[PDB]
Write a protein that binds this ligand. Structure first.
Ligand SMILES: Nc1ncnc2c1ncn2[C@@H]1O[C@H](COP(=O)(O)OP(=O)(O)O)[C@@H](O)[C@H]1O
Ligand SMILES: Nc1ncnc2c1ncn2[C@@H]1O[C@H](COP(=O)(O)OP(=O)(O)O)[C@@H](O)[C@H]1O
Ligand SMILES: [Mg+2]
Ligand SMILES: [Mg+2]
Ligand SMILES: [Zn+2]
Ligand SMILES: [Zn+2]
Ligand SMILES: [Zn+2]
Ligand SMILES: [Zn+2]
Ligand SMILES: [Zn+2]
Lengths: 142, 299, 795, 75, 100
């Protein structure tokens, strides 16, 4: 019996050691997956960049440092306008072209809150009740 | 899920993994099925594999329910207990599972490959639940036989009205007629996605098939075809709804001088009205498929 | 005081701010019910600003004439002229000195309420002329800030640092940040936020944030910036994925007209409209309840707490409430004394930095914020990072600023009002370092019994009675008082949040350097105070106010609550006459309080201790992060020597930009009834055993609603969740001592439903088998002794 | 218990509507949410019953969604 | 006593397993049958209310006289309702008046 109880402790600590080893490893094969995912996300975001416009605005910077809030506002090629009602639509982007951020944008698409396509003739004062507001208009920099 | 045993309709939570249809089985019936046949995989709410770091044991007499999961002989927590024992297989509703022997016809139904002829004459003279299970597994086997077929490809196109065919080397070639359809692939780099629903038929001269499509896509030579599969749904409803003999016609109404041509089948129309279901058997071209239209003119 | 405001109405009318019928509106003064009042107050701004300019002339006229004197607000009319020279003594010309300490400091809350410096946004400082078109790439307005300071606050003789990285301590960070709050209102809103820079790693150009431009803290640059790298470690990958530089630089431009908040970018190609589901109805419990006589017509107990559903325009309608956060310039000579008193309140605890192996996380299966929730929970990032590269990240945050995106998450919970509730899911890169920075002090606060901040004090086993006996800590004429903070987390000024963060960081006097503490404060501001907010796949800018998801949320909220209470007491004591104060000790206390506010620049620790003793003796408090019970002296408060409800209303008006209606604030003249409500629990005095104790009971509607409506379909089975009802019966036990029988029947209803649930559970189990369970200890859950022992002080 | 009772029927009705993917049509889900919330915040029984009629009309208007005949033959 | 203790110990783990598996199976199952259960519960509660307007619209829906839009509450508002046969028209429509 003295050499036995020791067997219980042996198997208990062996299972604990094996579980600890599995946890330390599975956790090492789950770390590489998230490292690869973060790398792919960062490099796709790199490939999305408007390199010429960003290069221009960053070379104009004296220190090489610019506010982040002007990076889209001066380099983004696509603008999404979310509009809650018809008066706002008439004010901000009525017509097929409009002006925002001291630039000229041309409407390329309009969708409703249901992600259904809306034509510019359907956005009227009388057809406003029949539209699922808000409307998301997507325009491209001209 | 919680279900009902196929051959005794007791409550159960076990299924046979090896069976194509994965049928529910109570504890006693599952023990009788697994200890005698070659099926040795049982799915509870969790499958009965061994939960070691890595271990692959599925035979149910090898396993134990240890700690909080199913573990094999030398992976078990030191505290047991055997799963497949005491004349039963441990599952939910353990002490309410009572079946019957039909565990001699169910072995034959589950094991048989539907190659011989006697499998059908035992799949149609058995009890009523087995009449449904055998039909279900027969449809499942007929579907899984298509998995052993050879997938096509296109040789070239001299004539756009007659496709050229090329079967994969090392597999049987399906017959070319209307009953069989195909759906394609374009697996080059570059779209392992279907390209339409096509069908084939042979040509008299040389090697050619005068095809047909649901759309009008052409096949750049890499595009090819595979015969489409069909998952088989549970045989949910009984084969024949049980018959009841009404005293008088219920739910149906006669007519005023139905016609001068259907005046002979009136008694059979009334008999149809009286019973829940009726069967009309007659030699061909005696007035069977016209009896139905006369019935419509009578109700 | 909205009941007595006749000089404010007369001032507004006589200077054409409004038309004397504007006050016929029901709540014209309310900042959140009538935001147009801001437009009215700003009509005074150019009259205030001219006054400021007049002062700088008058000061000069004294300085060149050799005339020494104190400038007071009561010697300057609203035109701006000065007329009281009685206490002016003349010295040699060219060497006079105007003392403008109390002039400017009392005026400071009015310089932003009236938006006095809006004429500085116009070219040639002319309100008719168009706005100044600043260069977009410009972010360093240090010379502009210095020109503003030398133009308006010229003879304010304390040193001003436009960038608070040069401040000498946290008493200097608050002063210069208070000036920066004012001066940042005249600069373009696109110039603040992270300052990005193009770096190269293994030859590919990243755009990463190498700094920040805070409206309060000025320009901050990172100290460890590697322009050329080769490999990115897991720590650097986490830093570059957390910050919004790449996400904003890659996403589309956004123009969201649904809000007035600054919209930065749209990350996806379409907007996400997240809805909120209704609750799941527990029909079995409701049938059981109505079979017991509940929910009748005219009954006192009725369903009022439900799961309210929300449409797709909910998350962006809740975020728009950050429109109630206005830039508030504080009284700095007063805030700098309130800080000392609050630090006296937080003197019994100990804190400092801990190692990564000493951090304990409660639940690791929690969201990691954006973008880290795309690959796992917080468990993934607490397992993937060793202690070495968690300490490396923490030491990185003491020399570099890491901006962070916080998600807005709609809350799916039971409530009595249909307005949507939103929480802030902060990134793991912020939560990890904030835990490592604050958790020692935070656990020290939660483990102290008998203090002002009751966090970590249970209400069970006599914990409620102990709390209420410590509140009544030998006050003379005790009255209980409780107030409300409307829009507390969204209207909190940035100065008060910075104050709370600096009070929490006073424990790091040996573990952190001065620059370490500044960069930790800057990380707090960049990740919590004014961050990028992900609301429906779109990045907006949070104007300010606390986010409810940072590591130190309840504790910083407690610091803010104590600060507002001390400010109310200071204002109450100073606004009293002084010739009417009969007690000669309180008159001298008022005299020395004014001296320590506006005639003293170094901390007088003796008087800070004396005022702390006065507040503890006469204004005893109990704080849980925005709930507060006070057991004040009623005679002193009637004489005006201690804060009342009206003082809290005044302080919240000029220092929170909210109106605290006296319909949400209660007063209890009888201590045998206890606080009217604290932590949503009413209190009643019961005879337990042989002695009378205070027990907390909830709203019976709340407990019945928790029983009837659930947030999951499987909480409706009942037999699966008997612990769910055991916990609810534990919470509903004290209702059995209520004199109203319909309240006392809720506990018996829960006990009877527990018994029915166990009966049918055993029936179903015996059906699923043919044997009963051998060991069943569920019989103790429908005996009331298991719940009676829950409120007995033996444990 | 009638007034108290309706407020629970509206909860079940909006749960059914959400299960029927009424949530996808934002213009309809806004009206359903408004009616549900105004039923829950009601003091008068007649107003709640009128709003319950309006809210049940959403369920009854979609023909292919639920089997009214089968559902009403189980009672 | 050693033989007795071990048995109790095993049997306690058996009861643990039985309870846990039952909870898992029933929980996964309940989610499984939710749509029909919720619809049956809804119509049970609708029948129990026995409001005359709700009963009217439900009885019309059984006949197929369903509305095309949300029934409006404001006065002089527009209701569009499909009538599938003369039977449903004769009861509901009297002259130019429509009872619904
Ligand atoms: N009562 C009748 N009198 C004369 N001709 C009949 C009568 N009933 C059937 N027939 C003829 O007998 C044929 C039977 O057709 P059908 O019932 O389709 O045979 P089957 O059912 O075997 O296919 C019909 O084409 C019809 O022309
Ligand atoms: N008891 C008093 N009676 C009359 N005048 C006084 C008294 N005490 C002080 N003053 C004068 O009043 C001035 C302060 O009064 P104040 O209310 O500031 O008047 P004003 O603002 O019109 O100058 C002092 O300069 C002093 O000359
Ligand atoms: Mg025929
Ligand atoms: Mg004076
Ligand atoms: Zn089998
Ligand atoms: Zn069986
Ligand atoms: Zn094994
Ligand atoms: Zn400073
Ligand atoms: Zn520290």
């Amino acid at each position: 019996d003295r050499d036995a109880a020791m067997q219980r402790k042996l198997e208990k600590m062996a299972d604990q050691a094996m579980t600890q080893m599995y946890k330390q490893a599975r956790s090492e094969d789950k770390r590489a997956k998230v490292t690869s995912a973060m790398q792919t996300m960062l490099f796709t975001m790199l490939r999305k960049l408007d390199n010429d416009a960003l290069n221009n605005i960053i070379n104009n910077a004296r220190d090489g440092c610019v506010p982040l809030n002007i990076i889209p506002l001066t380099t983004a090629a696509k603008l999404m306008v979310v509009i809650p009602d018809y008066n706002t639509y008439k004010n901000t982007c009525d017509g097929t072209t409009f002006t925002y951020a001291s630039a000229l944008w041309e409407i390329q698409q309009v969708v409703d809150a249901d992600s259904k396509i809306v034509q510019l003739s359907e956005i009227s004062m009388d057809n406003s009740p029949n539209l699922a507001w808000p409307l998301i208009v997507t325009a491209l920099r001209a | 899920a919680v279900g009902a045993c196929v051959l005794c309709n007791s409550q159960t939570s076990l299924r046979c993994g090896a069976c194509i249809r994965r049928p529910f089985l109570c504890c006693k019936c599952c023990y009788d099925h697994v200890i005698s046949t070659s099926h040795k995989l049982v799915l509870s709410v969790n499958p009965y594999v061994c939960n070691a770091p890595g271990c692959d044991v599925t035979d149910v007499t090898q396993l134990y329910l240890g700690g909080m999961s199913y573990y094999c002989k030398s992976h078990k927590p030191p505290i047991s207990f055997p799963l497949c024992a005491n004349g039963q297989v441990f599952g939910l509703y353990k002490n309410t599972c009572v079946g019957s022997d039909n565990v001699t016809d169910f072995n034959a139904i589950a094991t048989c490959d539907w190659t011989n002829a006697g499998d059908y004459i035992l799949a149609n003279t058995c009890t009523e639940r087995l009449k449904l299970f055998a039909a279900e597994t027969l449809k499942a086997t007929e579907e899984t036989f298509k998995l052993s077929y050879g997938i096509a490809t296109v040789r070239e196109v001299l004539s756009d009205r007659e496709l050229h065919l090329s079967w994969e080397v090392g597999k049987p070639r399906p017959p070319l007629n209307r009953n069989y359809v195909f759906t394609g692939y374009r697996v080059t780099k570059n779209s392992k996605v279907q390209i339409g629903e096509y069908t084939f038929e042979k040509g008299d001269y040389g090697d050619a098939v005068v095809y047909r499509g649901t759309t009008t896509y052409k096949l750049n030579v890499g595009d090819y075809f595979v015969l489409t599969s069909h998952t088989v749904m549970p045989l949910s409803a009984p084969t024949l709804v049980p018959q009841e003999h009404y005293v008088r016609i219920t739910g149906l109404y006669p007519t005023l001088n139905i016609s001068d041509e259907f005046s002979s089948n009136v008694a059979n129309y009334q008999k149809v009205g009286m019973q829940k279901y009726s069967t009309l058997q007659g030699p061909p071209g005696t007035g069977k498929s016209h009896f139905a239209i006369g019935l419509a003119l009578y109700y | 005081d909205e009941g007595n405001c006749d000089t404010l109405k007369e001032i507004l009318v006589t200077y054409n701010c409004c038309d004397d019928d504007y006050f016929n509106k029901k709540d014209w003064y309310d900042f959140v019910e009538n935001p147009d009042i801001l437009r009215v107050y700003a009509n005074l701004g150019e009259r205030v600003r001219q006054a400021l300019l007049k002062t700088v002339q008058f000061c000069d006229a004294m300085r060149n004439a050799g005339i020494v004197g104190v400038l007071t607000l009561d010697n300057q009319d609203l035109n701006g002229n000065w007329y009281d020279f009685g206490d002016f003594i003349q010295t040699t010309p060219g060497s006079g000195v105007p003392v403008v300490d109390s002039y400017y400091s009392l005026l400071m809350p009015i310089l932003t309420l009236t938006r006095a410096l809006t004429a500085e946004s116009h070219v040639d400082t002319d309100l008719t002329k168009p706005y100044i078109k600043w260069d977009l790439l410009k972010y360093d307005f240090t010379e502009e800030r210095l020109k503003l300071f030398d133009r308006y606050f010229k003879y304010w003789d304390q040193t001003y640092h436009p960038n608070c990285v040069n401040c000498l301590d946290d008493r200097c960070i608050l002063h210069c940040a208070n000036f920066n709050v004012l001066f940042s209102t005249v600069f373009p809103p696109t110039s603040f936020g992270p300052l990005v820079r193009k770096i190269f790693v293994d030859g590919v150009p990243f755009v990463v944030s190498t700094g920040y431009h805070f409206r309060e803290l000025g320009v901050v640059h990172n100290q460890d910036v590697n322009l050329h790298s080769s490999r990115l470690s897991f720590k650097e990958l986490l830093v570059y994925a957390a910050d919004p530089a790449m996400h904003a630089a890659s996403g589309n431009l956004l123009l969201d007209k649904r809000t007035t908040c600054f919209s930065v970018a749209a990350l996806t190609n379409n907007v996400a409209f997240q809805t909120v589901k209704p609750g799941n109805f527990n029909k079995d419990f409701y049938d059981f309840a109505v079979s017991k006589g509940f929910f009748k017509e005219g009954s006192s107990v009725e369903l009022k707490h439900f799961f309210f559903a929300q449409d797709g325009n909910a998350a962006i309608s809740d975020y728009d409430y950050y429109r109630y956060n206005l830039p508030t310039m504080c009284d700095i000579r007063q805030l700098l004394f309130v800080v000392e008193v609050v630090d006296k309140y937080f003197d019994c605890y100990d804190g400092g930095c801990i190692n990564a192996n000493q951090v304990i996380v409660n639940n690791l299966d929690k969201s990691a914020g954006f973008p880290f929730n795309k690959w796992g929970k917080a468990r993934l990032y607490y397992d993937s990072m060793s202690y070495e590269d968690q300490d490396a990240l923490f030491a990185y945050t003491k020399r570099n600023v890491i901006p962070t995106i916080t998600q807005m998450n709609l809350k799916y919970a039971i409530s009595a009002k249909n307005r949507a509730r939103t929480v802030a899911g902060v990134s793991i890169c912020s939560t990890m370092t904030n835990r490592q920075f604050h958790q020692k002090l935070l656990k020290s606060i939660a483990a102290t019994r008998g203090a002002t901040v009751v966090i970590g004090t249970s209400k069970f086993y006599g914990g409620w009675h102990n709390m209420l006996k410590t509140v009544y800590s030998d006050v003379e004429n005790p009255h209980l008082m409780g107030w409300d903070y409307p829009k507390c987390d969204r209207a909190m000024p940035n100065m008060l949040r910075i104050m709370a963060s600096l009070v929490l960081a006073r424990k790091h006097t040996t573990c952190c350097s001065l620059s370490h503490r500044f960069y930790r404060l800057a990380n707090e501001c960049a990740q919590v105070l004014s961050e990028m907010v992900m609301c429906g796949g779109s990045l907006y800018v949070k104007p300010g106010g606390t986010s409810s998801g940072d590591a130190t949320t309840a504790y910083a909220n407690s610091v803010f609550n104590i600060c507002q209470a001390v400010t109310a007491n200071v204002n109450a004591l100073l606004s009293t006459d002084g010739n009417k104060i009969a007690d000669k000790y309180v008159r001298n206390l008022q005299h020395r309080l004014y001296e320590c506010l506006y005639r003293n620049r170094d901390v007088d620790t003796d008087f800070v201790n004396e005022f702390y003793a006065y507040l503890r003796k006469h204004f005893s408090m109990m704080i849980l992060s925005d709930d507060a019970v006070v057991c004040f002296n009623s005679t002193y408060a009637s004489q005006g020597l201690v804060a009342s409800i009206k003082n809290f209303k005044s302080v919240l008006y000029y220092q929170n930009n909210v109106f605290m209606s006296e319909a949400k604030c209660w007063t209890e003249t009888d201590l045998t009834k206890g606080p009217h409500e604290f932590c949503s629990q009413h209190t009643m005095l019961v005879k337990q055993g042989d002695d009378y104790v205070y027990l907390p009971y909830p709203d019976p509607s709340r407990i019945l609603g928790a029983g009837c409506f659930v947030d999951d379909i499987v909480k409706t089975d009942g037999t699966l969740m008997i612990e769910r009802f055991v916990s609810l019966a534990i919470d509903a036990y004290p209702l059995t001592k209520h004199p109203n029988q319909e309240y006392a029947d809720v506990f018996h209803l829960y006990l009877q439903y527990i018994r029915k649930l166990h009966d049918e559970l055993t029936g179903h189990m015996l059906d699923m088998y043919s044997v009963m369970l051998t060991n069943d200890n569920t019989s103790r859950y429908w005996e009331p002794e298991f719940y009676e022992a829950m409120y007995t002080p033996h444990t | 218990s009638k007034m108290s009772d309706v407020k629970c029927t509206s909860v079940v009705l909006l749960s059914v509507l959400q299960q029927l993917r009424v949530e996808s049509s934002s213009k309809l889900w806004a009206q359903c949410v408004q009616l549900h919330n105004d039923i829950l915040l009601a003091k008068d029984t007649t107003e709640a019953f009128e709003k319950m009629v309006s809210l049940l009309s959403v369920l009854l208007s979609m023909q292919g969604a639920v089997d009214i005949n089968k559902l009403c033959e189980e009672m």
